């Protein structure tokens, strides 16, 4: 029965704020001139930062939690990962997918993530993972709004009945149409697959999220077709180009020309730091490229870009706890967004920009919006990122759905001293 | 009055182990065939991992904790960092250096680090930071063995009285002789500075740790002189080449030839992931090189390499909590040591290999050694790294000097559920 969040700091705002709640929504937001006393029905942010929930714009819940089953990827390569996944085929069932997806979703709830977009491989005639994920979506709805992308992993034109299966996935309820041009047999199939993807999105009124140019090939430019088609249909807001790691290898002249179109099209971009730094640059000896898309330049140009985890504890990425501040930390380093303001503003890459990517209509600490917000025990984005703080409280519909009692560290010098890693 | 560590897991060993303690030393280590009961004077590792303390082989305690004073580095560049540091000159006093060094040292104690090698800028006629650090070394001795490197930041031959000041630092007690060849005015001064560095190390019987080829210049090959001189003097074990980021840009043929000498010389290498990924590759547009030395290849060749944090909360690196598992996480990603075994064995890069780099004589969980060890609430190195676990207990001389009560996370679904991020 929470009525107020008090003593809240807000990004880009001075001072402390009080967030009033009513009927599961934010009724008003008022500045405070000092610290407010706690009381029944008040959740004290304790001068910590309050932001609208973290978002996971790109993850594969159908493959999550499978690392080491039955064997571990020892080389760490994409190739071996594919083989290790194949060895687990006998365990891939409806219940298995639901159990693993739920395990990661619980970690996400614990990490203040209330919006998740999962890709699901639909290059499977039985659509086993998709059927399982559609049930998971309904089951987790009280805690996470889950979007499902029908992802034609083996291609649309390069896989038997690929287009038919992609459309079947949409008819079953998938929220987003996926594609993977650079994986199609030819450049022509790649371009044609995008026309088919856009046609399906318009036919069913769905969003689009393409695994776009995820390859260190300076000639992989499917992103220009994604942006051009979006501009032509006037649907930029509903379109996302995931990865675009090839952009890391483009010459500057083409990239400059392309950026005009990217801005005009209004499409969204997702970079996946943890996985990109790991899987890109694998064909280089030395020097080795970083392989993340042009995040810094997109921000400078006002192009919406955000960060996803992509994989959690699977053959393609053995690590992760589904933590967005960890994803952000990696991205700030690899993209060299290390100035104070760049780091502080970093939270945008895992909150607001990701909400835009998911085309969310009810997101942000604003009057009238649902009371969905989280509290970080930190002074600002810089502090939260530097100390990799947990989510103190996650509030959804005005109710607490997760909480973390912080770790307590003590050093025993001449006298015991508490250490909080602040100066 | 601890007499035993029980239920301990050890890297590379099967099962649980009991570590007996007597007179501040490890008296014996015995395998257990099951879980042992707790009791008075027994520290229960609770099937967590027990390892010899984390080590910080490369940090600058003279510059730590100064970020944002008086202004923040907004571009994040090395150039601006130098300017921001210059603006703080009026605050650089004896007491200031001691206060800041101690602040970071407390974070290190909290993070299970009992061995630290700090570089101290001795291109200052007043040697202010060095005098302060020598007192800090004595003060922190009960918790951390601190090694001080006399670091001629502005060069030995390229700075007024550079050589005289370097020797004065040694006469005052600095443990290690530093150098920075690539920063000298000419290649010839660079090579000559190394001869002078080795001569001083032999004259005073000190270790050597060179800021070596920290630059994206494929022609910066001072590392071959460091290794050759060490081989000639038969002192490889006492010598360290820090950074060697230029090696990331060498052609493969030269690198292969060089590796024979690196192995034969027996010198140590320190990579500083967090700072290297941030400061290297700054002159590239796109693609952008990673800029970390050849860590993977050194491991494959049996060349001792380890990881340092380098900078903590300063103009050259605004982040950090002086956490070695965080440094390791970055290094595993950038160096693409992402296979299961590579990640699991990762702890070696922040424990044993770093101890070798510091030429430590009393390190490791072995009978006869001082009872210096830490307990991680994780099953193995992979688990500790993936979950970025805190140090549950840090034991020194058989006594607890630090402890962390873990954070407690709960998600409120149909029923409350504890989340520990394990599957
Ligand atoms: Fe993906
Ligand atoms: Fe350094």
UniProtKB/Swiss-Prot annotation, chains A, B:
Key words, A-Z: Cytosine metabolism, Hydrolase, Iron, Metal-binding, Zinc
Cofactor, how bound (note): The purified enzyme contains a mixture of Fe(2+) and Zn(2+) bound in the active site, and a single equivalent of metal is required for full catalytic activity. After removal of the metal, the reconstitution of the enzyme with Fe(2+) gives the highest activity, followed by Mn(2+), and, to a much lesser extent, Co(2+) and Zn(2+).
Phenotype when changing residue 310 to G/S: Still active towards cytosine. Shows increased sensitivity to 5FC
Binding site for Zn(2+): 58, 60, 211, 310
NCBIfam families, alphabetized: PRK07572.1 (NF005748), PRK09230.1 (NF006685)
Family from the record: Belongs to the metallo-dependent hydrolases superfamily. Cytosine deaminase family.
Protein name according to UniProt: Cytosine deaminase
Organism: Escherichia coli (strain K12)
């Amino acid at each position: 029965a929470l009525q107020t969040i008090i003593n809240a700091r807000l990004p880009g705002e001075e001072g402390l704020w009080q967030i009033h709640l009513q009927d599961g929504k934010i009724s008003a937001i008022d500045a405070q001139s000092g610290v407010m006393p706690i009381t029944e029905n008040s959740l004290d942010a304790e001068q910590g930062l309050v932001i609208p929930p973290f978002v996971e714009p790109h993850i594969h819940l159908d493959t999550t939690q499978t690392a080491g089953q039955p064997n571990w990827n020892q080389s760490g390569t994409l190739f071996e990962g594919i083989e290790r996944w194949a060895e687990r085929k006998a365990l891939l069932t409806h219940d298995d997918v639901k159990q693993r997806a739920w395990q990661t979703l619980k970690w996400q709830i614990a990490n203040g993530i209330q919006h998740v977009r999962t890709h699901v491989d639909v290059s499977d005639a039985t659509l086993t993972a998709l059927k399982a994920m559609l049930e998971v979506k309904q089951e987790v709805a009280p805690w996470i709004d889950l979007q499902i992308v029908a992802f034609p992993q083996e291609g649309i034109l390069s896989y038997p009945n690929g287009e038919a299966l992609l459309e079947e996935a949409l008819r079953l309820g998938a929220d987003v149409v996926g594609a993977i041009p650079h994986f199609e047999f030819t450049r022509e199939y790649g371009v044609e697959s995008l026309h088919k993807t856009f046609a399906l999105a318009q036919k069913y009124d769905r969003l689009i999220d393409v695994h776009c140019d995820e390859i260190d090939d300076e000639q992989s430019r499917f992103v220009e077709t994604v942006a051009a088609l979006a501009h032509h249909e006037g649907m930029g807001a509903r379109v996302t180009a995931s990865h675009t790691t090839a952009m890391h290898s483009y010459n500057g002249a083409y990239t400059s020309r392309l950026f005009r179109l990217l801005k005009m099209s209004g499409i969204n971009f997702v970079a996946n730091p943890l996985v990109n730094i790991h899987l890109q640059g694998r064909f280089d000896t030395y020097p080795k490229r970083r392989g993340i898309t042009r995040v810094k330049e997109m921000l400078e140009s006002g192009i919406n870009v955000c960060f996803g985890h992509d994989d959690v504890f699977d053959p393609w990425y053995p690590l992760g706890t589904a933590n967005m501040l960890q994803v952000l930390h990696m991205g700030l380093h690899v993209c060299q967004l290390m100035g104070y303001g760049q780091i502080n503003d970093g939270l945008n890459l895992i909150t607001h920009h990701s909400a835009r990517t998911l085309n969310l209509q009810d997101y942000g600490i604003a009057a009238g919006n649902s009371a969905n917000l989280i509290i970080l025990p930190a002074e600002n984005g810089f502090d939260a990122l530097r100390r990799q703080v947990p989510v103190r409280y996650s509030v959804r519909g005005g109710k607490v759905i997760a909480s973390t009692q912080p770790a307590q560290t003590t050093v025993y010098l001449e006298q015991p001293e508490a250490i909080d890693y602040k100066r």
